[PDB]
């Protein structure tokens, strides 16, 4: 039995909460807080360990974009610092391939990244790889068939609907079919043969629409929309289902957690986080202790 981990986030100020949800009994667990508060970060799992990457600490004492990478061990319930990225990345995108972590775009100060970095766990090192064709922050990133996808985001001027794909063996980026909707800060994940883009901000209102890209047919298609509209949401897949946690709808920071079942193409409210928030890194791994 695995769990859904939610790290950091934002509600009134960046939070350092590490909470976990168990789909089996619907309960939550609070774990060791993050050493430093952060939101706009990305989470991911490698070799059973949880990684909190980038983000920003939006506090009263001031904003501080982070280039930190920290590891959380369910076995000990403790956070250990790792090699830091060559640059701070707020509202970062993250994906994993062959046990390697890819940090995509994000922002630093008023600058929007197009750069990308790859982290080697065993050697504990980061190295820059080919930069995206576009500068993107608030970008959603997912990995399918060992290929990395960068969807939507913001290049400083316009919210994007475009997306591209990175092919490791060639260290090159290639644009792909753009989405039907301009999406910034959407939850992007992979389920079966599709890359999902849920919610986000199109420059006018937080979205509740969800579209998926078929790598084969190379086209996007709208599926059942989520109950709530939500941007800067946490997302992840668990036992053939999409889970979207929190986010901002333009009025309040949501605490609702919706679940998507492809079979019946329907969403359901499955639980609520201990409290509403946005920009939280999400990932799945073994339960603690």
């Amino acid at each position: 039995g695995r769990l859904i981990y939610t790290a950091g986030g934002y509600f009134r100020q960046s939070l350092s909460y590490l909470e976990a949800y168990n789909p089996s009994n619907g309960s939550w667990l609070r774990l060791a807080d993050l050493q430093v508060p952060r939101s706009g970060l990305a989470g991911c799992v490698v070799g059973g360990l949880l990684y909190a990457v980038g983000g920003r600490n939006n506090s009263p004492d001031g904003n501080t974009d982070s280039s930190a990478l920290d590891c959380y061990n369910p076995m000990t319930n403790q956070w250990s610092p790792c090699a830091s990225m060559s640059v701070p990345r707020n509202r970062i995108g993250v994906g994993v391939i062959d046990g390697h972590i890819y940090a995509v775009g994000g922002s630093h100060g008023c600058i929007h990244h197009s750069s990308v970095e790859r982290y080697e766990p065993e050697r504990d090192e980061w190295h820059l790889v080919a930069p995206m064709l576009t500068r993107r922050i608030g970008v959603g990133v997912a990995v399918l068939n060992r290929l990395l996808y960068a969807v939507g985001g913001f290049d400083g001027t316009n919210r994007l609907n475009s997306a591209e794909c990175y092919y490791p063996e060639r260290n090159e980026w290639r644009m792909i079919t753009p989405m039907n909707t301009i999406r910034s800060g959407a939850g992007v994940c992979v389920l079966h043969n599709c890359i999902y883009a849920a919610g986000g901000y199109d420059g006018q209102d937080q979205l509740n629409s969800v579209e998926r890209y078929d790598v084969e047919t190379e086209t996007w298609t709208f599926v059942a929309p989520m109950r709530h509209h939500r941007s800067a949401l946490g997302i992840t897949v668990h036992q053939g289902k999409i889970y979207v946690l929190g986010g901002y709808d333009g009025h309040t920071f949501l605490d609702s957690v919706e679940c998507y079942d492809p079979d019946s193409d329907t969403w359901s409210e499955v639980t609520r986080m201990t409290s509403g928030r946005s920009g939280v890194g999400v990932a799945v791994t073994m339960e603690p202790c």
Binding site: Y10, S39, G40, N58, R91, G138, F154, R159, S184, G185, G200, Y201, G203, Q206, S231, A232, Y248, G250, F253, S278, G279
Partner: peptide, 8 residues
């Protein structure tokens, strides 16, 4: 307020 995230 940031429309996309709701952050101040």
């Amino acid at each position: 307020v940031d429309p996309s995230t709701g952050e101040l």
